[PDB]
Structures are given as C-alpha cells and as structure tokens.
C-alpha cells in the first residue's frame, strides 16, 4: 500500500513550486508545464488513495458514520486530519482572493474527495442523509418564524399565509442571479417552510425587479451569476454542491429530522408539496429547479433554458432529470445545443403544467396551492418520487458531478 | 411621393418623421422608427407610410419591399426593435385621430396599395395589362 505518503510527497512537490515560482500570469512554458504536471501526479494520487480508503477516511472523520457532517464541515475536517488530501481553510482563502482565471484549481481535490465519498454504498448515503438535516440558521430562526409568520433574508423573503410558505426570490438588482449567499437564504427558507407545522404547501416565485430593463415586473431567475464565476466567487462545495445536496434535494425528500415526534418510524423525513410559478423567464439554475416541483406555473411570455452549451459549466442535476421530463432527444437539444423552450410552444408542456396570461397568473397560482392540501397528496407525491428518481440514481449522478464539475470550473473556456 | 421620387431614385435614401425608407440590393426597406413611442400610429405616420409605399413601388430599382421596426429609445425598450403598438391611445382621447385623414386614408391608402399596387397614369409600356404596379412585400 504505502499509498498515503506517496500521495504526500506528491502534495509536497506541489507545495514547493507553490513558492519558488512567480505569480500565476508571469510563468513560462516549462514554468507552467511543470506545476501542471505536478498537480496531475498529485490529483492522480489523491484518487488511488481514496478508491481504496474512502470509507476509512470517512469513518475517521465521522466516528464511523456516527456523526452527520455537512459538506463544509466534512471537507474541513478532511483537511486537518489528512493534509494534502483536500485544501485547508486558508489555502482556499488564498484562492478566492485571486480571480477564477488565476487560481491553481485547488477545489478539484475536494471534487476528487467528495466523489469517492458518495461512490461508497456506506459513506455516500450518510453524507447525503447529513445534507438533509435541518440547517442550524434554520433551527435558529424557527421559533421566531412560527410566531412571526415572516422572515426577511438577503435573497429570499419567506412568509407563511393561509398555510402556504411563500418564498420570494427578491434580488431587486440582478434578476435573482444565483450566488453562494442566496443558496444559503434558500436552504433556510426551505427548512423553515418544512418544519413550520403551520405550513402545508410551498410556493416559489420571483419578486418584482427594480432594475430598469425590468422595473415593476417579476423575474424568476437568470441562472448563476456569470460575474462572480470569473471573479472566483462560486464555491464548488459551499455553492455548487451545497445546492444540489442541500435545498434542491429537500424539495424532493424533505428535511431529515431527529427522532422526536410521533411518526418518525414511518416518516423520518418531513416533506411537503411545492409549487413554482415562472414570471418572465427561468434561465439556468432557475430552470433546473423546475424539474423538482410538484406543480409548475408560468406566464405565457416565459421561456426556459440552460444555454451554457459551448462554454459554460454543467447545469447542475438537469442532466439527471431533464431526461425523464422530455426524452433523450430534447434533453440534448436543450443542454447540448443550447435550445430554449418557449412557455407557449407545445413542447413547453413537458416542463410546465399551466401557462396563462400574466394578468391572471396570480389566480392561476392561488387556485393552485389549494389543490395540493390533503395528506393523500403527501403519500402519492412521495411514492412518485421514489419511482422517478431513486437513491442510488441520485447518488451515482452526484458522485461524478462532484469531480466532473470541479474540472469544468477550472477549464479555460468557461473562465 | 411623386415629389420625392427623383430625389429618392438618385439618393436611395429618404428620411421621414415616422418611416425611414431605403433602397438596397433591390429592396425598399421601410423602418418604423418612433424612437419615443413604440411606433404608436398617428395620422402623420399614415402619411410617411403611404409615401414610403409609393416611392417603393415606383422606384424601378425596387423588386421587393420590407417592413420592420427600428430600434427603440424608450427605457422599457432601449436597444431593442418593436414593430408597432397599434394606434396612439392618447391622441384618440385628445381628438387627434381623423376618421378621414387617418382611419379611412389608412385602409384606402397604403394598406390597399400593399395589396393591389399604385394605380399609375397611362405612360409606360404594359399599362394595358398592368395598370397597377405591385410588388411583393415582407413584414
Ligand atoms: C437574462 C438576460 C438575457 C437579460 O437580458 P436583458 O433584458 O438584456 O438584461 P440585462 O441588461 O443584460 O440584465 C439586467 C440586469 O441584470 C443583471 N444580470 C442579468 N443576468 C445576470 C446574471 N446571470 N448574473 C448577474 N447579474 C445578471 C445584469 O448585469 C443587469 O444589470 P447591469 O449589468 O448593471 O446592467 C441577461 O441578463 C443574460 O444573458 N444573463 C445570462 C444568463 C446566464 O447565462 N446565466 C448562466 C446560467 N448558468 C448557470 O445557472 C450554471 C449553474 C447554475 C447553478 O445554480 C448550478 C449549476 O450547477 C450550474
Ligand atoms: C405595448 C404596451 C403593452 C407596452 O407595455 P410596456 O412594456 O408596459 O411599455 P409602456 O411603459 O406602457 O410604454 C412604453 C412607452 O411607449 C408609449 N406607448 C406604448 N403604447 C402606446 C400607444 N399605443 N400610443 C402611444 N404611446 C404608446 C408609452 O406611453 C410609453 O412612454 P411613456 O408613456 O412616456 O412611459 C403598452 O404600451 C400598451 O398597452 N399599449 C396599448 C396598446 C394598444 O392598446 N393600442 C391600441 C390599438 N388599437 C388600435 O391600433 C385601433 C386601430 C388602429 C389603426 O391603425 C386602425 C384602426 O382602424 C384601428
């Protein structure tokens, strides 16, 4: 074996040329070619080590699948207990400071790690279960929310009403452009919504926009913030992964709670039906989410796309779900050739449920929430998802994502 | 229209309040350019319009007509083209929409010409079979 230290000298060399060399941007050509070759031998080693020792590494970080740790926690714990395996807090810090164009791509290691972890029939279901458990900030504002009925947060605006946990994407500057802070307000909005006994149905829509091109009109989402992407503001873990293992997964299976409240034996997870309404447009992550709700509504002037095709990154868990919604044929016209389905064209019914004129969307929406109330819906919903997307299916997909995405991050053309 | 014909034929460009005519590659491109008001129709446009059509039809150098909307200046649509927002609801209340000089002149004037052409004078060989010069138009 002696795979460990092997891996270690590997991170060693890399650590070395990490100082000797000059800032990235002034190297040459055996300058670059050398650091680059280094990394490869290191990452190559990071893999072989984990292919045979992931479960161990995981067991040590979580006292043998006995302590649920969220993505951030797990990768951090990994860093200090296995230096060289994955970046440390500070190491990343150096990185985030630079612009996504000049980083050494240290996230790729987290990509190699998180991958091997989810690949195991033991560690993966656990890291997952762990990302389904209520988010602290959420358990923090729960009581206040239950008594108030209103939580105001930077990107999301939650509000309980008539038994509806209405969420409202309100980036009154930037068309709800996603960013790793929204992914936080979002996962908290979901949790609260799920744990509030007074909520029966969830609603996701876009608040009115302030920007001139859209002042006075709602907009669902403009995908990911292309800006922070170049600037080095999109975390592979704290955003891209936290997103698909965090809230988006909760919208499917619910919040894994603690054995406390009668029924846990049959429902360890609290789930509820959710309804998404589309105003203006759903581009990117905006569209991705529509493949996970129980009911999608959209004004006739809308359209949807993931039109990162020739240069952008992988559109989340779309590659995993769009298939079951519109076949492999369309699935690829959308994701591979960058096509967009207009709210009113026939093929829009593969993604949306109802399409009405914006000056009746409100009622279409209300009359919608009252139709998913009963506990009959909770059961049928839950079985339907068990069929559409299964545990192994999501795990396998999320595994390869962990890495694939990493690499797609630090790829010349996307940058 | 017969006034600005010769000038148009030699120029290839006529600039008018609401419409912007221009011959190119044998195309009489018209361009609805109310860079304030979304091409909102009004009995003055109905004038620039019927002249754009005539010139377009009588210019021997034109074979096909094109009707489109110029880029808009207004904030709700700055940098984007808009075809037309119908009639100017404003002048309608204000008493600016002529039953004759606009509503009728419109349907008996240019819109009819886009169908049957410009009735010309017995002058030019062929009048016996084509007293009217028509051409295909693309919107
Ligand atoms: C939506 C648009 C077509 C609107 O066109 P317009 O009417 O021309 O409005 P604009 O003037 O361009 O923009 C209005 C306003 O919003 C801002 N805006 C619009 N889109 C964005 C984005 N994406 N980020 C930040 N700010 C934005 C824009 O900068 C403007 O403010 P100013 O720059 O100061 O003028 C345009 O904004 C646009 O093309 N955005 C590109 C949309 C895009 O490509 N998003 C990429 C999506 N790619 C992903 O989501 C990838 C992804 C996301 C995930 O969540 C997970 C995952 O795994 C992968
Ligand atoms: C097109 C719209 C939906 C655009 O909505 P928005 O994106 O909300 O833009 P707005 O802010 O409302 O308008 C942008 C801008 O264009 C101006 N605008 C828009 N439409 C018009 C019209 N119709 N006239 C004048 N100005 C207009 C509008 O006043 C704004 O400038 P400001 O008032 O200073 O803000 C709106 O402008 C609108 O509803 N217009 C009403 C359109 C309409 O009903 N036209 C009526 C058509 N009725 C006929 O054509 C009748 C007719 C016509 C004929 O030619 C022949 C005939 O026999 C019969």
XYZ file of C-alpha atoms and ligand atoms in Angstrom:
672
model
C 0.000 0.000 0.000
C 2.138 2.873 1.287
C -0.227 4.936 -0.815
C -0.583 7.730 1.768
C 2.905 9.285 1.996
C 3.113 8.574 -1.742
C 0.238 10.956 -2.103
C 2.049 13.154 0.477
C 5.346 13.721 -1.315
C 3.074 14.486 -4.266
C 1.382 17.377 -2.411
C 4.895 18.046 -1.193
C 6.444 18.881 -4.582
C 3.342 20.867 -5.386
C 3.679 22.798 -2.103
C 7.275 23.552 -3.125
C 6.770 25.112 -6.562
C 3.956 26.870 -4.728
C 6.530 29.422 -3.574
C 9.608 29.165 -5.780
C 7.585 30.138 -8.887
C 6.322 33.691 -9.589
C 2.675 34.758 -9.538
C 0.386 32.912 -11.996
C 0.371 35.138 -15.050
C 4.117 35.504 -15.428
C 5.242 31.887 -15.709
C 6.535 30.209 -18.884
C 6.171 27.177 -20.606
C 8.350 24.985 -18.638
C 7.339 27.245 -15.772
C 3.655 26.383 -16.248
C 4.156 22.937 -17.775
C 5.958 21.915 -14.552
C 3.405 22.963 -11.895
C 0.751 21.467 -14.170
C 2.490 18.095 -14.452
C 2.942 18.160 -10.664
C -0.712 18.662 -9.837
C -1.663 15.840 -12.174
C 0.577 13.358 -10.386
C -0.871 14.616 -7.095
C -4.543 14.534 -8.027
C -3.922 11.233 -9.775
C -2.684 10.012 -6.403
C -5.484 11.620 -4.448
C -7.777 9.321 -6.414
C -5.995 5.967 -5.991
C -5.747 6.555 -2.263
C -9.466 7.164 -1.904
C -10.565 4.396 -4.285
C -9.294 2.042 -1.606
C -9.518 4.110 1.591
C -12.526 6.417 1.279
C -14.709 4.549 3.744
C -11.830 4.553 6.226
C -11.131 8.254 5.735
C -14.872 8.829 6.066
C -15.150 6.666 9.142
C -12.393 8.578 10.877
C -13.944 11.940 10.062
C -17.372 10.863 11.308
C -16.608 8.338 14.088
C -17.802 5.539 11.794
C -20.903 7.043 10.196
C -21.998 8.084 13.678
C -21.898 11.874 13.294
C -23.679 13.686 10.461
C -21.434 16.323 8.899
C -22.475 18.792 6.176
C -20.308 19.403 3.115
C -18.356 22.333 4.532
C -17.738 20.582 7.846
C -16.697 17.298 6.185
C -14.193 18.830 3.770
C -12.719 20.981 6.524
C -12.433 18.039 8.897
C -10.832 16.190 5.991
C -8.247 18.938 5.506
C -6.851 18.996 9.047
C -6.963 15.201 9.503
C -5.384 14.369 6.129
C -3.195 17.296 4.981
C -2.623 17.067 1.248
C -5.917 15.261 0.533
C -8.009 18.426 0.340
C -7.321 22.186 0.663
C -7.352 23.819 4.097
C -9.491 26.775 5.044
C -6.681 29.276 4.448
C -5.456 27.566 1.255
C -8.853 28.188 -0.289
C -8.764 31.734 1.056
C -5.662 32.499 -0.975
C -7.610 31.124 -3.935
C -10.908 33.009 -3.511
C -8.823 36.208 -3.309
C -7.431 35.678 -6.803
C -9.802 35.753 -9.780
C -11.208 32.383 -11.069
C -8.850 32.907 -14.008
C -5.603 32.612 -11.987
C -6.347 30.024 -9.268
C -4.349 26.784 -9.059
C -7.623 24.852 -9.047
C -7.374 23.576 -5.503
C -11.121 22.824 -5.471
C -10.558 19.929 -7.878
C -9.222 17.995 -4.889
C -12.460 18.484 -2.975
C -14.032 17.293 -6.204
C -11.891 14.131 -6.127
C -12.693 13.627 -2.435
C -16.441 14.316 -2.316
C -16.628 11.997 -5.311
C -15.076 8.918 -3.775
C -17.156 9.556 -0.631
C -20.505 9.470 -2.483
C -19.334 6.472 -4.531
C -19.422 4.260 -1.446
C -22.601 2.389 -0.553
C -21.764 3.400 3.061
C -20.339 6.903 3.158
C -22.438 8.403 0.347
C -25.933 7.709 1.784
C -24.572 9.238 5.003
C -23.090 12.420 3.583
C -26.432 12.688 1.851
C -28.592 11.989 4.868
C -26.402 14.610 6.533
C -27.257 17.266 3.938
C -30.965 16.669 4.500
C -30.911 17.506 8.200
C -32.113 20.976 9.160
C -29.648 23.771 8.705
C -28.676 25.459 12.026
C -29.517 29.023 10.831
C -32.909 27.469 10.139
C -33.403 25.894 13.589
C -32.159 29.252 14.865
C -34.943 31.293 13.261
C -37.649 28.600 13.575
C -39.450 29.693 16.740
C -39.226 33.332 15.678
C -40.674 32.395 12.287
C -43.575 30.340 13.738
C -44.721 33.225 15.920
C -43.974 35.887 13.323
C -45.008 34.315 10.057
C -42.345 36.414 8.360
C -38.575 36.055 7.849
C -36.689 38.596 5.764
C -33.403 37.483 4.236
C -30.997 38.974 1.706
C -32.025 36.959 -1.387
C -35.183 35.156 -0.221
C -38.283 36.510 1.501
C -40.231 33.757 3.347
C -43.794 34.228 4.575
C -46.486 31.902 5.869
C -50.048 32.655 4.799
C -53.215 30.572 4.593
C -50.933 27.595 5.234
C -48.560 28.488 2.438
C -44.828 29.004 2.920
C -44.417 31.530 0.140
C -40.786 32.080 -0.800
C -39.930 35.075 -2.925
C -36.680 35.423 -4.846
C -36.023 39.140 -4.454
C -32.739 40.308 -5.965
C -34.113 43.756 -6.768
C -30.856 44.436 -8.533
C -29.701 41.471 -10.556
C -32.601 39.311 -11.745
C -32.251 36.858 -8.834
C -28.851 35.915 -10.241
C -27.836 32.984 -8.004
C -24.796 33.160 -5.696
C -23.473 31.196 -2.771
C -25.240 33.533 -0.363
C -28.649 33.037 -1.958
C -28.008 29.284 -1.760
C -27.926 29.966 1.952
C -31.115 32.074 2.339
C -32.707 29.499 0.053
C -31.855 26.395 2.066
C -33.067 28.152 5.151
C -36.297 29.201 3.538
C -36.968 25.565 2.656
C -36.183 24.177 6.117
C -38.322 26.694 7.973
C -41.049 26.075 5.425
C -40.846 22.330 6.057
C -40.575 22.439 9.868
C -43.298 25.044 10.397
C -46.293 22.891 11.427
C -48.458 25.663 10.054
C -47.247 25.167 6.501
C -48.901 22.621 4.201
C -47.736 23.793 0.779
C -44.705 25.676 -0.508
C -44.561 28.330 -3.229
C -41.508 29.591 -5.106
C -41.791 32.756 -7.190
C -39.914 35.883 -8.162
C -40.371 39.263 -6.582
C -40.743 42.462 -8.581
C -37.475 43.720 -10.112
C -36.022 47.225 -9.611
C -33.518 47.246 -12.466
C -34.536 49.474 -15.452
C -34.822 46.693 -18.086
C -37.377 45.150 -15.744
C -38.778 47.703 -13.330
C -42.168 46.746 -11.964
C -42.089 43.228 -13.337
C -41.299 39.909 -11.649
C -38.469 37.659 -12.861
C -37.893 34.074 -11.736
C -34.167 33.617 -12.176
C -31.283 34.406 -14.541
C -29.298 31.314 -13.613
C -25.910 31.648 -11.962
C -24.110 34.982 -11.522
C -21.722 34.871 -14.541
C -19.790 37.653 -12.816
C -18.708 36.002 -9.574
C -17.925 32.973 -11.786
C -14.958 34.692 -13.401
C -14.101 36.595 -10.228
C -13.738 33.392 -8.197
C -16.934 33.648 -6.199
C -18.630 30.371 -6.956
C -17.694 27.705 -4.456
C -17.548 24.147 -5.766
C -18.553 22.964 -2.295
C -20.211 25.845 -0.481
C -22.405 26.574 -3.545
C -22.396 24.101 -6.472
C -22.556 21.014 -4.226
C -24.378 22.523 -1.222
C -27.024 23.469 -3.748
C -27.815 20.012 -5.083
C -27.344 18.132 -1.794
C -28.861 20.958 0.234
C -32.172 22.626 -0.632
C -32.901 21.155 -4.061
C -32.783 17.682 -2.540
C -35.008 18.793 0.311
C -37.670 19.888 -2.145
C -37.765 16.233 -3.172
C -37.342 14.163 0.004
C -37.806 16.680 2.822
C -35.906 17.532 5.998
C -34.325 14.618 7.813
C -35.320 15.330 11.407
C -34.278 13.855 14.745
C -36.240 11.028 16.340
C -38.537 13.269 18.382
C -42.084 13.435 17.119
C -44.637 10.669 16.688
C -44.466 9.112 13.250
C -40.698 9.229 12.747
C -40.770 5.453 12.225
C -42.762 5.821 9.011
C -41.687 9.325 8.055
C -38.190 10.131 9.273
C -38.375 12.912 6.773
C -40.899 15.689 6.583
C -41.784 16.530 3.023
C -44.431 18.771 1.543
C -45.701 19.606 -1.915
C -44.143 22.606 -3.597
C -45.401 24.879 -6.359
C -43.201 27.002 -8.634
C -44.516 29.961 -10.643
C -42.492 31.424 -13.532
C -42.581 35.137 -14.413
C -40.513 36.408 -17.312
C -38.022 33.566 -17.508
C -36.174 30.614 -15.986
C -32.569 30.537 -17.177
C -30.076 28.096 -15.670
C -30.487 27.092 -12.026
C -33.804 28.775 -12.350
C -34.827 26.179 -14.877
C -33.064 23.348 -13.071
C -35.311 23.761 -10.064
C -38.466 23.375 -12.159
C -37.587 19.710 -12.530
C -38.236 19.094 -8.859
C -41.551 20.805 -8.020
C -44.987 19.232 -7.838
C -46.591 21.891 -9.961
C -45.104 24.452 -12.307
C -46.968 27.553 -13.495
C -45.642 30.105 -15.967
C -46.937 33.228 -17.672
C -47.291 32.820 -21.417
C -44.489 35.296 -22.046
C -41.933 32.986 -20.442
C -39.319 30.547 -21.699
C -36.632 28.299 -20.159
C -33.021 27.374 -20.923
C -29.617 26.179 -19.600
C -27.915 27.644 -22.616
C -24.478 27.073 -21.170
C -23.627 24.733 -24.060
C -20.437 25.705 -25.895
C -18.517 27.138 -22.929
C -20.383 27.098 -19.627
C -20.366 24.551 -16.828
C -22.663 21.545 -16.180
C -26.184 22.789 -15.351
C -26.479 21.026 -12.004
C -28.757 17.996 -11.775
C -30.501 18.866 -15.022
C -28.527 16.264 -16.980
C -30.012 13.786 -14.499
C -33.614 14.925 -14.598
C -34.398 16.648 -17.888
C -34.197 13.213 -19.408
C -37.284 11.882 -17.659
C -39.198 15.065 -18.494
C -38.579 15.401 -22.251
C -36.709 12.343 -23.570
C -33.028 11.962 -24.555
C -33.695 13.789 -27.823
C -34.988 17.070 -26.407
C -32.858 16.666 -23.312
C -29.797 17.147 -25.572
C -31.209 19.897 -27.791
C -31.603 21.865 -24.571
C -28.368 21.051 -22.724
C -26.011 20.208 -25.633
C -27.112 22.559 -28.456
C -28.352 25.268 -26.093
C -32.014 25.411 -27.180
C -34.797 27.109 -25.236
C -38.423 26.077 -24.927
C -40.878 28.962 -25.055
C -43.686 28.899 -22.488
C -46.307 28.743 -25.251
C -44.806 26.269 -27.723
C -46.277 22.761 -27.385
C -43.025 21.304 -26.008
C -43.308 23.673 -23.034
C -45.859 21.293 -21.521
C -43.105 18.766 -20.910
C -41.759 21.145 -18.300
C -44.629 23.380 -17.176
C -48.125 22.426 -16.000
C -50.102 25.574 -16.633
C -49.461 28.596 -18.806
C -51.651 31.700 -18.538
C -51.519 35.423 -19.319
C -49.557 37.338 -16.661
C -52.709 39.258 -15.774
C -54.303 36.100 -14.431
C -51.230 34.237 -13.244
C -51.952 35.303 -9.664
C -55.296 33.446 -9.511
C -53.984 30.514 -11.519
C -51.377 30.373 -8.752
C -53.750 30.682 -5.811
C -56.277 28.203 -7.133
C -53.160 26.029 -7.493
C -51.987 25.906 -3.874
C -55.377 24.829 -2.574
C -55.278 21.705 -4.770
C -52.280 20.000 -3.101
C -53.521 20.194 0.522
C -54.604 16.720 1.629
C -52.370 14.058 3.190
C -53.326 11.930 0.180
C -51.054 14.195 -1.833
C -48.162 13.682 0.627
C -48.297 9.936 0.077
C -48.755 9.931 -3.688
C -46.090 12.588 -4.138
C -43.705 10.513 -2.065
C -44.211 7.335 -3.998
C -43.959 9.155 -7.335
C -40.548 10.455 -6.434
C -39.469 7.045 -5.232
C -40.153 5.961 -8.788
C -38.906 8.951 -10.847
C -35.549 9.363 -9.126
C -34.196 6.774 -6.705
C -31.491 6.929 -4.014
C -28.812 5.056 -5.975
C -29.661 7.107 -9.081
C -29.099 10.444 -7.432
C -26.042 9.261 -5.542
C -24.281 7.886 -8.611
C -25.005 11.047 -10.540
C -23.938 13.402 -7.741
C -20.740 11.453 -7.344
C -19.383 12.000 -10.835
C -20.739 15.538 -10.639
C -18.537 16.312 -7.652
C -15.455 15.810 -9.843
C -16.668 16.489 -13.383
C -17.954 19.863 -12.262
C -14.782 20.699 -10.396
C -12.798 20.293 -13.608
C -15.414 22.173 -15.599
C -14.879 25.004 -13.171
C -11.165 25.481 -13.815
C -11.414 24.985 -17.551
C -10.053 27.604 -19.894
C -13.179 28.329 -21.980
C -15.617 28.592 -19.023
C -13.258 31.035 -17.319
C -44.416 60.759 -53.173
C -44.106 61.936 -56.799
C -42.396 64.961 -55.257
C -39.583 62.981 -53.625
C -39.378 60.271 -56.325
C -36.489 61.529 -58.452
C -34.562 62.536 -55.338
C -35.154 59.066 -53.894
C -34.065 57.209 -57.073
C -30.739 59.032 -57.176
C -30.263 59.011 -53.412
C -31.524 55.625 -52.335
C -32.490 57.191 -49.019
C -35.497 59.198 -47.781
C -35.745 60.195 -44.133
C -39.205 60.930 -42.772
C -40.634 61.551 -39.310
C -42.140 58.093 -38.634
C -40.789 55.993 -41.524
C -37.243 55.603 -42.820
C -37.161 54.326 -46.445
C -34.017 52.951 -48.073
C -33.297 51.019 -51.247
C -30.635 48.323 -51.035
C -29.860 45.241 -53.111
C -33.217 45.895 -54.778
C -35.092 46.076 -51.507
C -37.210 49.046 -50.449
C -36.644 48.633 -46.737
C -39.080 50.659 -44.658
C -38.325 51.145 -40.996
C -40.915 52.223 -38.446
C -38.816 54.457 -36.209
C -40.772 56.158 -33.431
C -37.783 56.197 -31.089
C -40.114 57.515 -28.441
C -43.453 55.764 -28.501
C -43.200 52.209 -29.836
C -44.211 53.235 -33.377
C -47.604 54.193 -31.963
C -49.587 55.034 -35.123
C -50.917 58.551 -35.800
C -52.278 60.430 -38.763
C -48.815 61.757 -39.552
C -47.232 58.310 -39.699
C -50.086 57.283 -42.008
C -48.618 59.949 -44.241
C -44.902 58.979 -44.126
C -46.150 55.421 -44.548
C -48.198 55.943 -47.702
C -45.305 57.815 -49.183
C -42.837 55.122 -48.297
C -45.015 52.605 -50.133
C -45.469 54.707 -53.278
C -41.788 55.520 -53.663
C -41.037 51.872 -53.000
C -43.456 50.833 -55.745
C -42.467 53.445 -58.354
C -38.707 53.079 -57.895
C -37.740 50.854 -60.858
C -34.810 49.732 -58.756
C -37.010 48.093 -56.145
C -38.199 44.498 -56.558
C -39.233 43.610 -53.010
C -40.477 45.585 -50.020
C -39.623 45.086 -46.347
C -41.463 46.444 -43.313
C -39.792 46.278 -39.905
C -39.325 48.213 -36.698
C -36.328 50.318 -35.855
C -34.546 50.161 -32.512
C -36.438 51.877 -29.668
C -35.000 54.613 -27.412
C -37.557 54.479 -24.608
C -36.252 52.872 -21.348
C -38.644 49.869 -21.268
C -37.201 49.010 -24.670
C -33.848 50.673 -25.223
C -31.722 48.900 -27.795
C -34.487 46.618 -28.983
C -36.728 46.804 -32.054
C -40.527 46.961 -31.767
C -42.957 46.543 -34.660
C -45.977 48.524 -33.547
C -48.151 49.268 -30.505
C -51.295 49.858 -32.538
C -52.954 53.259 -32.539
C -51.887 56.114 -30.246
C -54.498 55.745 -27.439
C -53.513 59.261 -26.383
C -54.410 61.312 -29.448
C -57.587 59.171 -29.519
C -58.990 60.829 -26.413
C -57.415 64.177 -27.267
C -59.183 64.346 -30.637
C -56.211 63.606 -32.849
C -57.404 60.644 -34.848
C -59.082 61.709 -38.055
C -61.901 59.494 -39.295
C -60.973 60.513 -42.838
C -57.400 61.767 -42.826
C -56.283 58.711 -40.789
C -58.764 55.846 -40.220
C -60.029 55.855 -43.825
C -56.898 57.172 -45.580
C -55.169 54.247 -43.929
C -57.278 51.443 -45.359
C -57.885 53.026 -48.779
C -54.385 54.484 -48.915
C -51.237 52.464 -48.205
C -52.691 49.220 -46.858
C -54.614 48.796 -50.099
C -51.509 49.586 -52.112
C -49.650 46.757 -50.422
C -52.284 44.519 -51.997
C -53.016 45.920 -55.468
C -50.222 48.436 -56.064
C -50.063 52.031 -57.275
C -52.550 52.987 -59.955
C -50.348 54.883 -62.397
C -51.072 57.042 -65.434
C -51.103 55.568 -68.928
C -47.440 56.277 -69.667
C -45.229 53.224 -69.679
C -45.395 50.118 -71.842
C -47.535 47.424 -70.281
C -50.226 49.633 -68.751
C -52.808 47.676 -70.760
C -52.113 44.508 -68.782
C -50.836 46.084 -65.584
C -52.386 49.482 -64.944
C -51.156 48.959 -61.448
C -47.629 48.345 -60.303
C -47.494 45.885 -57.457
C -44.610 44.157 -55.751
C -44.181 41.505 -53.095
C -43.782 42.732 -49.547
C -42.215 41.126 -46.490
C -43.010 42.036 -42.875
C -31.243 37.315 -18.689
C -30.617 38.191 -19.772
C -30.817 37.512 -21.114
C -31.397 39.515 -19.740
O -31.102 40.321 -20.907
P -31.540 41.863 -20.614
O -33.009 42.092 -20.743
O -30.640 42.178 -21.774
O -30.962 42.383 -19.194
P -29.516 42.816 -18.925
O -29.291 44.238 -19.271
O -28.461 42.023 -19.610
O -29.510 42.495 -17.381
C -30.356 43.146 -16.448
C -29.505 43.299 -15.212
O -29.417 42.022 -14.508
C -28.077 41.652 -14.377
N -27.951 40.242 -14.684
C -28.582 39.530 -15.675
N -28.192 38.252 -15.714
C -27.275 38.162 -14.657
C -26.530 37.081 -14.132
N -26.578 35.858 -14.609
N -25.711 37.314 -13.063
C -25.633 38.586 -12.552
N -26.295 39.640 -12.947
C -27.115 39.370 -14.013
C -27.335 42.390 -15.471
O -25.932 42.504 -15.160
C -28.051 43.737 -15.494
O -27.553 44.698 -14.541
P -26.439 45.525 -15.187
O -25.300 44.596 -15.618
O -25.910 46.545 -14.176
O -26.990 46.254 -16.413
C -29.144 38.526 -19.443
O -29.067 39.130 -18.128
C -28.288 37.252 -19.564
O -27.944 36.778 -20.683
N -27.868 36.578 -18.411
C -27.073 35.403 -18.788
C -27.896 34.349 -18.079
C -26.956 33.190 -17.899
O -26.333 32.753 -18.858
N -26.873 32.547 -16.658
C -25.996 31.458 -16.754
C -26.616 30.238 -16.048
N -25.665 29.301 -15.859
C -25.927 28.615 -14.666
O -27.057 28.967 -13.880
C -24.954 27.476 -14.235
C -25.294 26.767 -12.956
C -26.084 27.411 -12.005
C -26.432 26.765 -10.829
O -27.262 27.373 -9.951
C -25.981 25.472 -10.578
C -25.182 24.823 -11.517
O -24.724 23.571 -11.264
C -24.841 25.467 -12.707
C -47.471 47.913 -25.670
C -47.645 48.012 -24.156
C -48.343 46.756 -23.669
C -46.223 48.075 -23.576
O -46.238 47.876 -22.142
P -44.835 48.417 -21.514
O -43.700 47.467 -21.703
O -45.591 48.413 -20.216
O -44.483 49.905 -22.047
P -45.127 51.205 -21.551
O -44.450 51.732 -20.345
O -46.581 51.136 -21.246
O -44.893 52.042 -22.867
C -43.607 52.343 -23.379
C -43.740 53.741 -23.930
O -44.436 53.705 -25.215
C -45.573 54.513 -25.153
N -46.676 53.812 -25.778
C -46.992 52.478 -25.689
N -48.115 52.175 -26.350
C -48.506 53.402 -26.904
C -49.582 53.767 -27.745
N -50.490 52.925 -28.181
N -49.688 55.073 -28.134
C -48.758 55.978 -27.684
N -47.720 55.737 -26.930
C -47.636 54.417 -26.566
C -45.921 54.623 -23.683
O -46.733 55.789 -23.430
C -44.545 54.703 -23.030
O -43.983 56.030 -22.973
P -44.403 56.704 -21.664
O -45.930 56.793 -21.604
O -43.807 58.112 -21.603
O -43.896 55.879 -20.480
C -48.355 49.327 -23.757
O -47.630 50.455 -24.307
C -49.823 49.280 -24.220
O -50.697 48.606 -23.607
N -50.223 49.996 -25.354
C -51.657 49.791 -25.587
C -51.572 49.252 -26.999
C -52.935 49.496 -27.583
O -53.934 49.122 -26.982
N -53.055 50.060 -28.859
C -54.409 50.119 -29.217
C -54.574 49.643 -30.673
N -55.797 49.994 -31.121
C -55.719 50.282 -32.489
O -54.473 50.180 -33.165
C -57.019 50.715 -33.232
C -56.877 50.996 -34.700
C -55.629 51.343 -35.213
C -55.470 51.580 -36.571
O -54.238 51.839 -37.065
C -56.561 51.492 -37.431
C -57.815 51.156 -36.927
O -58.883 51.092 -37.762
C -57.974 50.905 -35.564
